[PDB]
Amino acid sequence: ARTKQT
Amino acid sequence: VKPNYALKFTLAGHTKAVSSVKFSPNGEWLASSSADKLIKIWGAYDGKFEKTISGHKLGISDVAWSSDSNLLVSASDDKTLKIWDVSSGKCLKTLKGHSNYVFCCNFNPQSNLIVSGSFDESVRIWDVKTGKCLKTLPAHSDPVSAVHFNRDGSLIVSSSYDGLCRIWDTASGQCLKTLIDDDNPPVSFVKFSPNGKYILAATLDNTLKLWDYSKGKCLKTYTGHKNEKYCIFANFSVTGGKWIVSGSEDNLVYIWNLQTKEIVQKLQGHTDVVISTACHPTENIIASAALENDKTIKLWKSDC
């Protein structure tokens, strides 16, 4: 999700 | 003139990082989404927990409200969007078509359409009534970080880790413009101004820019905050002073004077990255939310 950096 | 936002409530209940907070257009509700696979609804003025909405099989990155405040759409790692009836909590439609994580979503002003952005590098346009995918746009060459309709829904703005911000004609699916910058750091967030003339774009070099859409020109830059890692929401605060509002990777909410670009306030309180901020449609109220060291939403109110 947006809550993990990618 | 500077705002004086002060903490009113801290809303606890999500069990993992919160991803996105949005006020209902009628100002009554705050919706939040989380890596915990849940949507929660909260009273905007008393912070009172209303209900949990569940059904997604993986974490949720974004949520958005219909214009009448009766429906929500959510975007999930489970590759689907879901359309929810807020009053019943029921899933009305599951929107299937994306081949990877759905990252971002929005209704158009009429709310007969939903736009989504995905890690599969496409932008999809969906019919709300049927749940059918109307158009798939080959929008970008990396994950799509944001999607937003303009004031009347005639245009879609998208952003991507490919370093681009593109504007699309809603009706035809055709690209009207790719924003021209000399460099291409990931674009982590984009949104039209309320009058649809400007675009606010975040890049992962700790920089927000206000772009004139008609001219293709950068008019303002906002800096001083930390943004190198996450797709953090930004806002136009229009109810009192004219501000730009953003979360930050230093655990603060940042508020800038839109015209001067000066930092007029920094809100302290969160204990993790402030991933999401939202501005109330009629009152000087900000909602902010943070990652997993914190997992709370904060509601803040100003006199201006």
Side-chain angles (χ1 to χ4, degrees), chain B residues 138-171:
Chain B
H140 291 285
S141 58
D142 275 309
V144 179
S145 59
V147 286
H148 181 64
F149 283 103
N150 70 345
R151 181 174 57 180
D152 77 320
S154 58
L155 311 173
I156 296 166
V157 65
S158 65
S159 58
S160 173
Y161 281 78
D162 71 2
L164 303 175
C165 162
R166 292 214 248 242
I167 296 81
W168 308 86
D169 181 61
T170 304

Side-chain angles (χ1 to χ4, degrees), chain B residues 52-115:
Chain B
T52 301
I53 295 164
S54 59
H56 278 294
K57 296 172 155 158
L58 296 170
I60 306 176
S61 291
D62 204 1
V63 72
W65 290 91
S66 62
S67 66
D68 68 2
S69 300
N70 292 140
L71 308 178
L72 280 171
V73 63
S74 48
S76 171
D77 286 8
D78 72 11
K79 305 193 248 213
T80 78
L81 305 100
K82 284 176 181 289
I83 306 175
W84 312 89
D85 182 296
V86 175
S87 63
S88 68
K90 296 189 195 170
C91 182
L92 300 184
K93 287 301 183 299
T94 303
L95 272 36
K96 301 177 170 182
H98 283 294
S99 62
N100 205 339
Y101 316 130
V102 195
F103 203 74
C104 50
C105 59
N106 264 130
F107 284 88
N108 63 339
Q110 180 183 348
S111 301
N112 60 312
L113 305 178
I114 286 161
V115 67

